[PDB]
Request: fold
Amino acid sequence: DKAKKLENLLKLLQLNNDDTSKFDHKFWRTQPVKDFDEKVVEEGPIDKPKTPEDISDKPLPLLSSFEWCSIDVDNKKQLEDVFVLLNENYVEDRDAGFRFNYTKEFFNWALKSPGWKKDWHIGVRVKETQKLVAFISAIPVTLGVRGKQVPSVEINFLCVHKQLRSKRLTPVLIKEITRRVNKCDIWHALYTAGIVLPAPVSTCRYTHRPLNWKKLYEVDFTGLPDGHTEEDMIAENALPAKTKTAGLRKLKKEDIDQVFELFKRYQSRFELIQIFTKEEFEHNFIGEESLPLDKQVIFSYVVEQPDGKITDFFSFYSLPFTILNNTKYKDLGIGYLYYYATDADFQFKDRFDPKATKALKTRLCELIYDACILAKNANMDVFNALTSQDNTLFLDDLKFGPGDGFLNFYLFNYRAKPITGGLNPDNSNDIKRRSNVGVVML
Ligand SMILES: CCCCCCCCCCCCCC(=O)SCCNC(=O)CCNC(=O)[C@@H](O)C(C)(C)COP(=O)(O)OP(=O)(O)OC[C@H]1O[C@@H](n2cnc3c(N)ncnc32)[C@H](O)[C@@H]1OP(=O)(O)O
Reply:
């Protein structure tokens, strides 16, 4: 009642002409989640503490015709099954012009994270045919939620085949993967969606830096502004071929220890983060051995000083679209800004000091300017960033356009207060406060 009131208001805040994928609440009403009207007095779990023994080993009943299944990443045939199911179904509109293009290379990187368990890469198949019709994945991480060590799981890649959509099969998937994670002494999750569900702990906005404006326009992924020319836009978004900041090079393995310190030192300013083990850190920021440029997933760069000191670190991952109804172009290169760290504001006591901000800003501008060059050179056509972290320092100056897509962050079975998503009351970039959202989901 005051739940629906505040939900409609939340939906109105986020109203737009769904860009990409975007889908009274009988399922979540029965779930360990913050409700909209609920003010949080103290942060912590929602359910009374439990043990694996209160949770059964028998998987939840599916309707007649279906069956569960693990997916072994390493098993080509099975892996392929996932990205076929995704690519064909992961975009609402069938004739939208674009399709997701999840590669084997990509899921090998994302789904094989330290502690990954094939039983957490869940699927559903038709009994008779063995057709994979639904998928959800879980991966282990300890989250940092305002100083508190939360041992949790990251749910991503929920997908249900379009032909049997709206069949309340999503609850079953969720319950079942909750079951499998509860049965291993994990009681929380971090999930993000573009859709508004009961527990938005945060909200950020997608933005786009054009790297190849001409192609972007020819594919209808960007507009031609009023009183402006095609050439004008080309000229406006023109990037140099070579990066500008001295010291810049790829992230070698030998850098892990020095970077990992700089990263958790830097990251420890945000209220919601993932606490990285040197193991999982190394896995995220160095991809499969020698992939070609059109298959490489994670791009990580560092700034080495003459004396060998590592000062800065930024990363980005590729996730291409397939472009359908278009004679000139078959696909669209998409870079996403990932995790980064810099020591440029370290010699300052307060993050929000006008001087500490000025310093951090002109550095982030330098680094992310180069990230763009690098991405363009990696043959990407557009560069996405999320108003999260300290992103709001450079988004505008670096010609990151406003993008009509919102990302809400959620915590399962845990209540936390609103965390700055880098947005103002009116959805413009909060350049004064920036964001305390430290995690970057896929
Ligand atoms: C350690 C404990 C474990 C923690 C577990 C964490 C669980 C959280 C996991 C959450 C995963 C997020 C992480 C990601 O991967 S977010 C990425 C999800 N991907 C997409 O949305 C792109 C492709 N979309 C689809 O395939 C859709 O058709 C899906 C399958 C998503 C919805 O299917 P459909 O449109 O054909 O209808 P339904 O009959 O199946 O189900 C309708 C009910 O389900 C609720 N719903 C619908 N969509 C979502 C959604 N995206 N997150 C959460 N809930 C969702 C909805 O509110 C309604 O419930 P209620 O409002 O009446 O109550």
Notes: DSSP finds nine helices and 18 strands in the chain. The chain has two domains: 1-193, 194-442.
